[PDB]
Amino acid sequence: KLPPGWEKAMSRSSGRVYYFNHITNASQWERPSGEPARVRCSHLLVKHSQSRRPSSWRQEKITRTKEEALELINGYIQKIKSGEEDFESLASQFSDCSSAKARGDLGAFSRGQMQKPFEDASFALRTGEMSGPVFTDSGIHIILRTE
């Protein structure tokens, strides 16, 4: 009886129930609250050596493994969720996307424009919500739905 995409789960380390969204890879403790023509998102991309284009403004030759990229993503998610860092700050500094220079903002978009896992996560996010790691041919994304 959750907004589709959501399932109940159990913390392995604490035993407390939590909720996990298999479209956004978001996870949270509270029972989730519960589509538009367009959404607006920012993202932080970490590329890896199997990215469609393993290069970025940060690195001419991206050589980190997918596993290493996921660990970087996971670390950014932790710092964002703790408030130690802001999403926009980490995107500006560390996103392997040209959108880093705009704090990760991609602007508004419809279905059919973005890579499908990105599109599905973006449209499943609530306004203001952040994704977990989202995988595309570009790399691994943290997605923030801003509108």
Ligand SMILES: O[C@@H]1C[C@@H]2[C@@H]3C[C@H](O)[C@H]4[C@@H]3C[C@@H]2[C@H]41
């Ligand atoms: O090894 C790691 C790297 C990432 C993707 C490749 C695959 O093999 C799985 C999938 C989700 C993680 C894990």
